[PDB]
Amino acid sequence: YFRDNGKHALIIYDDLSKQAVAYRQMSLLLRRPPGREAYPGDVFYLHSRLLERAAKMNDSFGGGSLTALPVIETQAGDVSAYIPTNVISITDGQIFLETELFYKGIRPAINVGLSVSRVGSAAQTRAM
Amino acid sequence: VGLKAPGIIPRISVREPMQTGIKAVDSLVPIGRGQRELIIGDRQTGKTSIAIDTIINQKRFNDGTDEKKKLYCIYVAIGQKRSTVAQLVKRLTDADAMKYTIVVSATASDAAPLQYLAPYSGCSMGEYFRDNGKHALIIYDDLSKQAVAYRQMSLLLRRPPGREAYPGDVFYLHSRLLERAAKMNDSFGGGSLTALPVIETQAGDVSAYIPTNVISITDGQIFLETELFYKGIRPAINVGLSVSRVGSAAQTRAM
Amino acid sequence: VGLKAPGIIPRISVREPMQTGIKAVDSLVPIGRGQRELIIGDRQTGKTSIAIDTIINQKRFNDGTDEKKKLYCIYVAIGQKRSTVAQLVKRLTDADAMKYTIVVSATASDAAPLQYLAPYSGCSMGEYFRDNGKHALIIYDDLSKQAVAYRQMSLLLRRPPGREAYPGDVFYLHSRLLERAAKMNDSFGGGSLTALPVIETQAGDVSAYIPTNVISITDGQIFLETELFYKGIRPAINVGLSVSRVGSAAQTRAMKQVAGTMKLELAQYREVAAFAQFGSDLDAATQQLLSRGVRLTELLKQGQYSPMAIEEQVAVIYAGVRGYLDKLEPSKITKFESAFLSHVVSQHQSLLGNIRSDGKISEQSDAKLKEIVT
Amino acid sequence: KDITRRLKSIKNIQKITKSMKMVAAAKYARAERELKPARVYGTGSLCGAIHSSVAKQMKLANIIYYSLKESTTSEQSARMTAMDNASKNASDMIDKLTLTFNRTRQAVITKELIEIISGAAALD
Amino acid sequence: SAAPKAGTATGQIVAVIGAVVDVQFDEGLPPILNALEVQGRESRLVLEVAQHLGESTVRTIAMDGTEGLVRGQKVLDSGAPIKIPVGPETLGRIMNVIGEPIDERGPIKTKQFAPIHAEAPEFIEMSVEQEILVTGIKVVDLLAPYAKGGKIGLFGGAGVGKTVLIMELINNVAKAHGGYSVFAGVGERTREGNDLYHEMIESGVINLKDATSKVALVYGQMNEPPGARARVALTGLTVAEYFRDQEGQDVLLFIDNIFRFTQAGSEVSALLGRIPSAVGYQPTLATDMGTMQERITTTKKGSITSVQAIYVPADDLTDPAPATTFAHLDATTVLSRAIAELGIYPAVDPLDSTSRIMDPNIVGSEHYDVARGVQKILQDYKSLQDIIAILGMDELSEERARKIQRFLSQPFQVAEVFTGHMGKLVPLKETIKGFQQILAGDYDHLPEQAFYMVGPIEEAVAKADKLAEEH
Amino acid sequence: GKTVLIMELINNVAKAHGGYSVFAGVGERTREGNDLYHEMIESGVINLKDATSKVALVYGQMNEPPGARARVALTGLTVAEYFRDQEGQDVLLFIDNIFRFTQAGSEVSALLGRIPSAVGYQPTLATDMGTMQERITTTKKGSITSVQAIYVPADDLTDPAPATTFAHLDATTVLSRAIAELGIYPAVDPLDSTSRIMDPNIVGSEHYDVARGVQKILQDYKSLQDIIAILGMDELSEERARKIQRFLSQPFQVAEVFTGHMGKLVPLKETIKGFQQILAGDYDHLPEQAFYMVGPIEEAVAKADKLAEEH
Ligand SMILES: Nc1ncnc2c1ncn2[C@@H]1O[C@H](COP(=O)(O)OP(=O)(O)OP(=O)(O)O)[C@@H](O)[C@H]1O
Ligand SMILES: Nc1ncnc2c1ncn2[C@@H]1O[C@H](COP(=O)(O)OP(=O)(O)OP(=O)(O)O)[C@@H](O)[C@H]1O
Ligand SMILES: Nc1ncnc2c1ncn2[C@@H]1O[C@H](COP(=O)(O)OP(=O)(O)O)[C@@H](O)[C@H]1O
Ligand SMILES: Nc1ncnc2c1ncn2[C@@H]1O[C@H](COP(=O)(O)OP(=O)(O)O)[C@@H](O)[C@H]1O
Ligand code: VO4
Ligand code: VO4
Ligand code: VO4
Ligand SMILES: [Mg+2]
Ligand SMILES: [Mg+2]
Ligand SMILES: [Mg+2]
Ligand SMILES: [Mg+2]
């Protein structure tokens, strides 16, 4: 509504991962042949289709915006699991949060080398 | 053979232990009567000997005084070569041990259903005692091999497989059974049935599907490690991955 | 193409070896005629070059005297880009090698059945010779890719899959085939067909389903490791995980004289060459069994678009097995193997001639060689 | 593929360590032949961790050679241990990580195999 | 007897899909396991019945190629399973999966033939008598002992020393053997079958002249369909059977890979209308390996001292193939691939090589103790070699093995084609003094690999000279 | 570092290229397609005025169905085709991930009435990747110098996706994830980066030798880094690499948006003298990471000054 009306917005998809756990369910019951870890094959078009909708709007179109941070569940530390690949392979910029650190005091606990801003220095204003 | 295990009220408390005669066993791991003690262990490791000693131990008992201080034996052979079985029947006969024992065989040739229905056939054997005051010791030699042998039967009926073909109710397979060797309260009979399910350890893993399925039930699991044995460390029991569970109730004041 | 392999009685014994021309190959791993030698190896490792040298080696033979001492070639391309194939056809044509070869292609575009039926098409090619006294060399470039390409066809017929989709008869797939390159007894023809099935090594695993399926058949498997190669160690053959199987029957008396120590000197040396890197205080002089891997290794690294005939292969390596070059720090050894020949075909034109006379190492030329080497 | 990687390092550590292991005793041989006459009544009347306990205790060919001669052996003993007490307790891992490959060698083989049939067997 | 009903024992092929031919009879349905004769042929094509699909249609497993078969071809009902001629009149000859002569020497004149599917010997037929039998091999004879009627099992991970060993056991045992012998080659190379043939001629074992032949050769290999590799093992067993029973003698049987009896099902299962299992396999592998191996045994009429071989797919003992098999073999020998690097040959491993005949009563108190002691030192050895010390030995704790490992690496006879090393053997004779020394410490010090590719302690000093170290 | 690299190859190669160019974006972000558009305007490549445009942009991405990602690669190829053939010219083609041509089937296979395979995939992936890639080639009428990109699902080269593909690419570059930690960029690995054009006849005897020698030292290097010495270097056996690893870590142009590092490049020019030194020993000693995020040997001493060590 905002990204199409000049106004901006911040959407948080808390656990797309759990939606992954929750998608296969529905498809298997329609008898749509499973593929990887039951994931209906279009597990991509599942999370491509969505993220691809939070975009930047040009003046000539509105100037509006929508920023999206998809939440994901890391299985012991693996960021490259099917679904994560499926999601990191799309999204531009991924903040990795490691349980491995946290208590160390290292909170947020971000692992550099396995997490990026991607969009580059355009985000960080001259200040940063 | 399709009986449902007794329950909360019929049962009481594992007391009046049963003597294996195996020092390391009893002393360390004491087996109480009316309970299920899992003897897991890889190929060549002693599972059948220990159980065979445990059974040979009732000798002096089956002809002496205290009737209640006795023990009848039911040996179930599942899969095994029918020669290995003749090895035991003859050998147990040497120590006269066969004179108070019942042995049942589902040796390879026998179609899968037999290697399946077999344990549920031995359970019932002993249940005669566990329901008539008398006590008993049943050994299910290789439930593991019965696992190899169950999936067969179900897949052919086209019952969707699940884990490693295992028909899903691979639990109800081995829950249903073990749950039948229980302790009998005076008020119900005082009888008992103790069961030691034999299991095949794959290189050392005790947590494989079926083992979990079985250790997740049984109270007390004696692990036999091929890794040791030759070391002289025989029986070769790994502490930290094997317990008596029932607690010190089994081990008399002596131990 | 659906013929059933001969059998116990038609066959005889792998004798009258076939020359790859690749020193390291033949000497170490000698290929006899009528047999199946598996050349497994990961991406970029030399499988097609070696086979291409092995085939280029029949040159001088296909126009000389002894008809029986010849070899026709059948090169099967399965999967490959049809440009890589044109790379070979043209390249083999450069050495005139194409003039006595037959090449068949099932290059990517071609529907799965073709990439399937292809080998069984080449088998039959050579069977013409193996059934007419004449001999042949067939190369099944990537049976592995044919594995990738077989399951396709079966799954679409709804033939229940088994392992990694592989239609169960993934064995009868590659048993049936290899089993067709056999040795022919005089009483049946004397002909032959030798086959080297190419296989794709996944990071180093030689025991994958299909490889097991193939190594579990073939007699003799030359493993090519990408892990080495660049090291200079090319062909890069791993001993302990690669054999000739057929035994010393392939290697003529010549190699049975020199090579007899080469491959198993390195069978356990894979330990010491895997230790020396940290010795110090051990058996002081155990260093010999070590001095003998390094220096030789640099003689054991054939590499070029050119084959060194049997009597030249009897020239340079022998010199090592009979430790004379020895001691000298390696490095320049490459120039020996290079120059020893330009030096041999310039003055020593008789010593090689004692292998086309006696066909082994002479008491004489032992000395003669021993004089140019020292 | 994967365990191959951490199984490489072990094997890579072997060559250097396991060979030096032999040296561990060799250093001894190249010492006693001359040290002995100078010892007992002949006069009077990684890298383990041996070359350390002596140095932390700070809180002319006579003694300087006699001591070093006996200290020589106390110093190389580190190799002894580095190749025998570092490798006695570092191999198991060869027999362990090799023994789970086949666990997750079999696994994958019996994991993806499920999927292949998970669709194949049920249709019409 | 083989005679059908007063109604057509002929069906017409209704479906062909590789190795599975469905057939449809109208007046006389042929039982499961019956051998069927395909008419319209240019050879002999037998289809073994396997199921009774209903709609009066059976389901067969092809015993040879199904090439050119046509939807309508007549298939004949023999009225009895595949039966091969059994008798002394099969010795010295080579049969195939049906009893057809393949050594080309013409018809196999015999008094009768026996069905390849026979009821396994009952409980009250078995025999507890385990009389020993010596091979004079290191690990193989000493460590994991063998025995009369006992089954041998060689677990190889594809080219690790499974078949070489068998030719060898033929060497010491087969030749010198009194009584008849058999060799069923299931699956494996035709190359070997050939050589094995001619080697058995070179050494008289098979003589084409007199009638002094003791071995019988049944083959069915690689260039054939699975219905064939499925039963060649059976046939070469139906042979050994007839000799033990109806002719009371202690036979020997050599199966070159007996689990090919299962690759078979793994190639026919799913295509039969079954739901897969472990690795894809079959919901029958257990009963399969079972029903079959429970024939190759002794009895109140005769004994069958057999020697099998079992392959390790993808090098995984974790395969329910080598695995399931174990429970049958009266002595184990899992040759390791990580062992062939080490050159240790045979690649028999100091762990997974069991036996149900290794007690002090039959092997020795002295012998079975140092065996426990050899694998003992070996166990903490397997750990130490890496654990604690980290590869490089030396370290500390001087608290033999590397020695003993070279001891049991007897390079013997069948391995001559590699480095001239010959028949390293001899029946126990001088193991005494020798191996015991190593363990207690005695005589143990000779400069490591200085005692590598040989066995007897007597060659420690008879080699020290070869490679000397002093001044 | 798969797509960053491609924009880069556009930088040095595309612009300066004579003849036409194409860019099929299959699967990947729309964000990039946009920027790539406007960047191609900022730099004239695509001019909206005259008719001085050389690239052609075919797209079909992520926010679309698989039938679309299945063929966008085809279309952007059908383009490059027409130019090479009917218009005899040596074209260039840029596919941003060409195996999306297979995610496609992996999303339509089973739902088409097919029995799954490797990972679930398809009993066609071989012929698929095949039939398609066997078009993007040269001929007796023109040439197509192409540049593709192939994704590694679950980081597993063991996927029959990156795998099967290999047999098509005339030069490999398996960028490693365990390499990005090390910062080494591009993440091209000293092992799995082959070529069917690396012989002394075309690359150099000198060049292809030290290449063998660079990966040689590198192989026993991969072992030593852990094996024998156990992580910590020093140990013994002084018997360069860490140097060369920094050499081939050219941070170049398309990576400016991170730390100002710019167009580290230059066509072979001064590789001579430089890299050879490292290996034979010459000039090799400069305090380790002191020569890290740069390439030319000339900047060993032109940085030693930046970070000095003495007294
Ligand atoms: N106390 C003992 N000490 C040393 N060895 C023994 C002892 N008791 C029995 N044995 C021997 O140990 C082995 C005991 O285990 P056994 O092989 O019978 O059973 P298992 O390994 O549990 O199962 P399986 O019969 O399938 O191998 C036998 O081979 C036997 O001869
Ligand atoms: N003796 C040699 N020494 C060094 N390099 C060689 C030698 N012979 C050929 N080469 C080069 O080595 C490579 C040989 O292997 P090639 O790539 O042809 O086959 P392959 O790796 O087995 O299979 P594929 O073609 O799929 O990569 C070629 O890239 C070629 O240019
Ligand atoms: N006794 C032995 N000594 C040395 N090497 C052997 C021995 N037996 C086998 N090998 C090696 O292992 C390879 C495979 O062995 P083989 O016995 O043919 O096994 P199988 O036929 O069962 O696969 C041979 O080619 C040879 O290199
Ligand atoms: N040349 C380079 N130098 C430094 N970092 C790089 C470079 N190329 C890529 N990266 C890092 O890796 C991330 C992923 O790279 P990218 O090229 O966008 O790969 P792809 O688009 O193919 O997934 C970037 O966000 C950046 O942090
Ligand atoms: O970031 V890429 O998922 O497109 O490899
Ligand atoms: O299987 V427990 O119920 O013991 O976790
Ligand atoms: O070589 V064997 O595949 O028959 O184990
Ligand atoms: Mg048992
Ligand atoms: Mg090739
Ligand atoms: Mg074999
Ligand atoms: Mg990208």
PDB file of N, CA, C and O in Angstrom, chain C residues 158 161-165 203 205 207-208 271 273-282, chain D residues 1 14-24 26-27 105 109 112-113 116 120 123:
ATOM      1  N   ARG C 158       8.929 -45.849 -16.552  1.00  0.00           N
ATOM      2  CA  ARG C 158       8.386 -46.143 -15.237  1.00  0.00           C
ATOM      3  C   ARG C 158       8.904 -47.478 -14.661  1.00  0.00           C
ATOM      4  O   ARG C 158       8.148 -48.222 -14.036  1.00  0.00           O
ATOM      5  N   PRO C 161      13.045 -47.086  -9.889  1.00  0.00           N
ATOM      6  CA  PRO C 161      14.455 -46.778  -9.687  1.00  0.00           C
ATOM      7  C   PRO C 161      14.940 -47.526  -8.471  1.00  0.00           C
ATOM      8  O   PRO C 161      14.124 -48.093  -7.752  1.00  0.00           O
ATOM      9  N   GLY C 162      16.249 -47.505  -8.232  1.00  0.00           N
ATOM     10  CA  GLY C 162      16.821 -48.145  -7.071  1.00  0.00           C
ATOM     11  C   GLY C 162      17.817 -47.137  -6.489  1.00  0.00           C
ATOM     12  O   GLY C 162      17.440 -46.087  -5.924  1.00  0.00           O
ATOM     13  N   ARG C 163      19.102 -47.480  -6.628  1.00  0.00           N
ATOM     14  CA  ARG C 163      20.132 -46.602  -6.123  1.00  0.00           C
ATOM     15  C   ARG C 163      20.354 -45.405  -7.056  1.00  0.00           C
ATOM     16  O   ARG C 163      20.527 -45.598  -8.265  1.00  0.00           O
ATOM     17  N   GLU C 164      20.408 -44.175  -6.492  1.00  0.00           N
ATOM     18  CA  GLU C 164      20.598 -42.916  -7.205  1.00  0.00           C
ATOM     19  C   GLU C 164      19.941 -42.991  -8.556  1.00  0.00           C
ATOM     20  O   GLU C 164      20.580 -42.765  -9.606  1.00  0.00           O
ATOM     21  N   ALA C 165      18.668 -43.347  -8.521  1.00  0.00           N
ATOM     22  CA  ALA C 165      17.833 -43.504  -9.687  1.00  0.00           C
ATOM     23  C   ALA C 165      18.252 -44.682 -10.550  1.00  0.00           C
ATOM     24  O   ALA C 165      17.380 -45.273 -11.178  1.00  0.00           O
ATOM     25  N   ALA C 203      35.720 -36.077  -6.857  1.00  0.00           N
ATOM     26  CA  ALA C 203      36.645 -35.541  -5.867  1.00  0.00           C
ATOM     27  C   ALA C 203      37.732 -36.455  -5.402  1.00  0.00           C
ATOM     28  O   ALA C 203      38.595 -36.056  -4.628  1.00  0.00           O
ATOM     29  N   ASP C 205      36.800 -40.089  -4.983  1.00  0.00           N
ATOM     30  CA  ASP C 205      36.169 -41.371  -4.701  1.00  0.00           C
ATOM     31  C   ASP C 205      36.105 -42.263  -5.880  1.00  0.00           C
ATOM     32  O   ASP C 205      35.517 -41.910  -6.909  1.00  0.00           O
ATOM     33  N   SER C 207      35.167 -45.524  -5.191  1.00  0.00           N
ATOM     34  CA  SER C 207      34.246 -46.541  -4.771  1.00  0.00           C
ATOM     35  C   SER C 207      32.766 -46.179  -4.787  1.00  0.00           C
ATOM     36  O   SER C 207      31.951 -46.796  -4.097  1.00  0.00           O
ATOM     37  N   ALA C 208      32.413 -45.183  -5.604  1.00  0.00           N
ATOM     38  CA  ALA C 208      31.042 -44.753  -5.724  1.00  0.00           C
ATOM     39  C   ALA C 208      30.268 -45.814  -6.473  1.00  0.00           C
ATOM     40  O   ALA C 208      30.845 -46.658  -7.139  1.00  0.00           O
ATOM     41  N   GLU C 271      54.052 -44.944   2.192  1.00  0.00           N
ATOM     42  CA  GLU C 271      54.130 -44.837   3.648  1.00  0.00           C
ATOM     43  C   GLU C 271      55.382 -44.008   3.904  1.00  0.00           C
ATOM     44  O   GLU C 271      55.323 -42.915   4.406  1.00  0.00           O
ATOM     45  N   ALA C 273      57.315 -42.372   1.833  1.00  0.00           N
ATOM     46  CA  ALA C 273      57.309 -41.110   1.107  1.00  0.00           C
ATOM     47  C   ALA C 273      56.293 -40.246   1.833  1.00  0.00           C
ATOM     48  O   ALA C 273      56.155 -39.046   1.558  1.00  0.00           O
ATOM     49  N   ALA C 274      55.583 -40.913   2.747  1.00  0.00           N
ATOM     50  CA  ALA C 274      54.550 -40.347   3.615  1.00  0.00           C
ATOM     51  C   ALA C 274      55.073 -40.336   5.055  1.00  0.00           C
ATOM     52  O   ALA C 274      54.298 -40.373   6.009  1.00  0.00           O
ATOM     53  N   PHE C 275      56.399 -40.306   5.196  1.00  0.00           N
ATOM     54  CA  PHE C 275      57.056 -40.279   6.504  1.00  0.00           C
ATOM     55  C   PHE C 275      58.337 -39.430   6.406  1.00  0.00           C
ATOM     56  O   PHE C 275      58.463 -38.398   7.050  1.00  0.00           O
ATOM     57  N   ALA C 276      59.284 -39.873   5.591  1.00  0.00           N
ATOM     58  CA  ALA C 276      60.550 -39.165   5.404  1.00  0.00           C
ATOM     59  C   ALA C 276      60.463 -37.677   5.719  1.00  0.00           C
ATOM     60  O   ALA C 276      61.399 -37.111   6.276  1.00  0.00           O
ATOM     61  N   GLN C 277      59.335 -37.053   5.379  1.00  0.00           N
ATOM     62  CA  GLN C 277      59.136 -35.628   5.629  1.00  0.00           C
ATOM     63  C   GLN C 277      59.353 -35.244   7.068  1.00  0.00           C
ATOM     64  O   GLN C 277      59.191 -34.086   7.432  1.00  0.00           O
ATOM     65  N   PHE C 278      59.709 -36.202   7.903  1.00  0.00           N
ATOM     66  CA  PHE C 278      59.934 -35.852   9.283  1.00  0.00           C
ATOM     67  C   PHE C 278      60.865 -36.755   9.977  1.00  0.00           C
ATOM     68  O   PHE C 278      60.893 -36.804  11.206  1.00  0.00           O
ATOM     69  N   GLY C 279      61.598 -37.522   9.207  1.00  0.00           N
ATOM     70  CA  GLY C 279      62.515 -38.383   9.871  1.00  0.00           C
ATOM     71  C   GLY C 279      63.606 -37.513  10.426  1.00  0.00           C
ATOM     72  O   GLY C 279      63.562 -36.276  10.439  1.00  0.00           O
ATOM     73  N   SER C 280      64.611 -38.217  10.887  1.00  0.00           N
ATOM     74  CA  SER C 280      65.770 -37.628  11.473  1.00  0.00           C
ATOM     75  C   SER C 280      66.460 -38.895  11.959  1.00  0.00           C
ATOM     76  O   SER C 280      67.061 -39.621  11.165  1.00  0.00           O
ATOM     77  N   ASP C 281      66.294 -39.200  13.239  1.00  0.00           N
ATOM     78  CA  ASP C 281      66.906 -40.372  13.859  1.00  0.00           C
ATOM     79  C   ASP C 281      66.149 -41.705  13.748  1.00  0.00           C
ATOM     80  O   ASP C 281      65.391 -42.084  14.650  1.00  0.00           O
ATOM     81  N   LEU C 282      66.390 -42.442  12.677  1.00  0.00           N
ATOM     82  CA  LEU C 282      65.727 -43.722  12.493  1.00  0.00           C
ATOM     83  C   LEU C 282      66.808 -44.714  12.104  1.00  0.00           C
ATOM     84  O   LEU C 282      67.830 -44.821  12.787  1.00  0.00           O
TER      85      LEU C 282
ATOM     86  N   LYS D   1      30.844 -36.439   0.123  1.00  0.00           N
ATOM     87  CA  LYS D   1      32.056 -35.584   0.278  1.00  0.00           C
ATOM     88  C   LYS D   1      31.998 -34.633   1.538  1.00  0.00           C
ATOM     89  O   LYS D   1      30.909 -34.250   1.956  1.00  0.00           O
ATOM     90  N   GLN D  14      50.389 -37.360   9.735  1.00  0.00           N
ATOM     91  CA  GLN D  14      51.059 -38.654   9.851  1.00  0.00           C
ATOM     92  C   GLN D  14      52.487 -38.624   9.310  1.00  0.00           C
ATOM     93  O   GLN D  14      53.446 -38.707  10.074  1.00  0.00           O
ATOM     94  N   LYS D  15      52.612 -38.517   7.987  1.00  0.00           N
ATOM     95  CA  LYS D  15      53.911 -38.490   7.311  1.00  0.00           C
ATOM     96  C   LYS D  15      55.029 -37.867   8.137  1.00  0.00           C
ATOM     97  O   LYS D  15      56.012 -38.534   8.472  1.00  0.00           O
ATOM     98  N   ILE D  16      54.875 -36.586   8.454  1.00  0.00           N
ATOM     99  CA  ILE D  16      55.869 -35.852   9.225  1.00  0.00           C
ATOM    100  C   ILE D  16      56.069 -36.414  10.630  1.00  0.00           C
ATOM    101  O   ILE D  16      57.192 -36.711  11.015  1.00  0.00           O
ATOM    102  N   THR D  17      54.967 -36.567  11.369  1.00  0.00           N
ATOM    103  CA  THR D  17      55.057 -37.067  12.741  1.00  0.00           C
ATOM    104  C   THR D  17      55.464 -38.544  12.862  1.00  0.00           C
ATOM    105  O   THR D  17      56.439 -38.874  13.538  1.00  0.00           O
ATOM    106  N   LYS D  18      54.723 -39.421  12.188  1.00  0.00           N
ATOM    107  CA  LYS D  18      54.946 -40.869  12.212  1.00  0.00           C
ATOM    108  C   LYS D  18      56.362 -41.331  11.777  1.00  0.00           C
ATOM    109  O   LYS D  18      56.864 -42.347  12.280  1.00  0.00           O
ATOM    110  N   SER D  19      56.994 -40.589  10.859  1.00  0.00           N
ATOM    111  CA  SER D  19      58.359 -40.878  10.357  1.00  0.00           C
ATOM    112  C   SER D  19      59.333 -40.406  11.439  1.00  0.00           C
ATOM    113  O   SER D  19      60.211 -41.156  11.868  1.00  0.00           O
ATOM    114  N   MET D  20      59.167 -39.171  11.904  1.00  0.00           N
ATOM    115  CA  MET D  20      60.050 -38.644  12.939  1.00  0.00           C
ATOM    116  C   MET D  20      60.040 -39.549  14.140  1.00  0.00           C
ATOM    117  O   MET D  20      60.988 -39.587  14.923  1.00  0.00           O
ATOM    118  N   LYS D  21      58.949 -40.289  14.264  1.00  0.00           N
ATOM    119  CA  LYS D  21      58.796 -41.220  15.353  1.00  0.00           C
ATOM    120  C   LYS D  21      60.008 -42.153  15.445  1.00  0.00           C
ATOM    121  O   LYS D  21      60.497 -42.461  16.535  1.00  0.00           O
ATOM    122  N   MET D  22      60.479 -42.609  14.290  1.00  0.00           N
ATOM    123  CA  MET D  22      61.635 -43.492  14.214  1.00  0.00           C
ATOM    124  C   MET D  22      62.866 -42.717  14.661  1.00  0.00           C
ATOM    125  O   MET D  22      63.720 -43.236  15.379  1.00  0.00           O
ATOM    126  N   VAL D  23      62.939 -41.459  14.247  1.00  0.00           N
ATOM    127  CA  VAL D  23      64.055 -40.600  14.609  1.00  0.00           C
ATOM    128  C   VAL D  23      64.135 -40.446  16.110  1.00  0.00           C
ATOM    129  O   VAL D  23      65.213 -40.350  16.702  1.00  0.00           O
ATOM    130  N   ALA D  24      62.968 -40.436  16.726  1.00  0.00           N
ATOM    131  CA  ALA D  24      62.878 -40.290  18.153  1.00  0.00           C
ATOM    132  C   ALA D  24      63.829 -41.194  18.911  1.00  0.00           C
ATOM    133  O   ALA D  24      64.318 -40.842  19.981  1.00  0.00           O
ATOM    134  N   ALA D  26      66.401 -42.720  17.143  1.00  0.00           N
ATOM    135  CA  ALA D  26      67.675 -42.548  16.473  1.00  0.00           C
ATOM    136  C   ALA D  26      68.589 -41.540  17.152  1.00  0.00           C
ATOM    137  O   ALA D  26      69.793 -41.777  17.275  1.00  0.00           O
ATOM    138  N   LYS D  27      68.028 -40.411  17.579  1.00  0.00           N
ATOM    139  CA  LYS D  27      68.827 -39.391  18.248  1.00  0.00           C
ATOM    140  C   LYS D  27      69.573 -40.029  19.425  1.00  0.00           C
ATOM    141  O   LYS D  27      70.709 -39.663  19.714  1.00  0.00           O
ATOM    142  N   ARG D 105      28.116 -42.131   4.600  1.00  0.00           N
ATOM    143  CA  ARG D 105      28.411 -42.535   3.235  1.00  0.00           C
ATOM    144  C   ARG D 105      27.129 -43.282   2.953  1.00  0.00           C
ATOM    145  O   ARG D 105      26.428 -43.019   1.974  1.00  0.00           O
ATOM    146  N   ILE D 109      23.385 -42.277   0.833  1.00  0.00           N
ATOM    147  CA  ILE D 109      22.936 -43.341  -0.068  1.00  0.00           C
ATOM    148  C   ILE D 109      21.554 -43.814   0.303  1.00  0.00           C
ATOM    149  O   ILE D 109      20.739 -44.149  -0.557  1.00  0.00           O
ATOM    150  N   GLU D 112      18.839 -39.870   0.071  1.00  0.00           N
ATOM    151  CA  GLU D 112      18.349 -39.436  -1.243  1.00  0.00           C
ATOM    152  C   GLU D 112      17.573 -40.567  -1.891  1.00  0.00           C
ATOM    153  O   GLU D 112      16.645 -40.332  -2.667  1.00  0.00           O
ATOM    154  N   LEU D 113      17.957 -41.797  -1.563  1.00  0.00           N
ATOM    155  CA  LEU D 113      17.289 -42.970  -2.103  1.00  0.00           C
ATOM    156  C   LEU D 113      15.818 -42.897  -1.716  1.00  0.00           C
ATOM    157  O   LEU D 113      14.946 -43.316  -2.473  1.00  0.00           O
ATOM    158  N   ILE D 116      13.951 -40.393  -4.156  1.00  0.00           N
ATOM    159  CA  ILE D 116      13.789 -40.980  -5.488  1.00  0.00           C
ATOM    160  C   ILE D 116      12.497 -41.812  -5.547  1.00  0.00           C
ATOM    161  O   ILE D 116      11.744 -41.722  -6.508  1.00  0.00           O
ATOM    162  N   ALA D 120       8.404 -41.654  -7.052  1.00  0.00           N
ATOM    163  CA  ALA D 120       8.289 -42.794  -7.969  1.00  0.00           C
ATOM    164  C   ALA D 120       7.176 -43.794  -7.676  1.00  0.00           C
ATOM    165  O   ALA D 120       6.286 -43.993  -8.507  1.00  0.00           O
ATOM    166  N   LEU D 123       1.670 -42.960  -7.618  1.00  0.00           N
ATOM    167  CA  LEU D 123       1.218 -42.153  -8.747  1.00  0.00           C
ATOM    168  C   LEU D 123      -0.253 -42.453  -9.077  1.00  0.00           C
ATOM    169  O   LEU D 123      -1.150 -41.767  -8.595  1.00  0.00           O
TER     170      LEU D 123
END
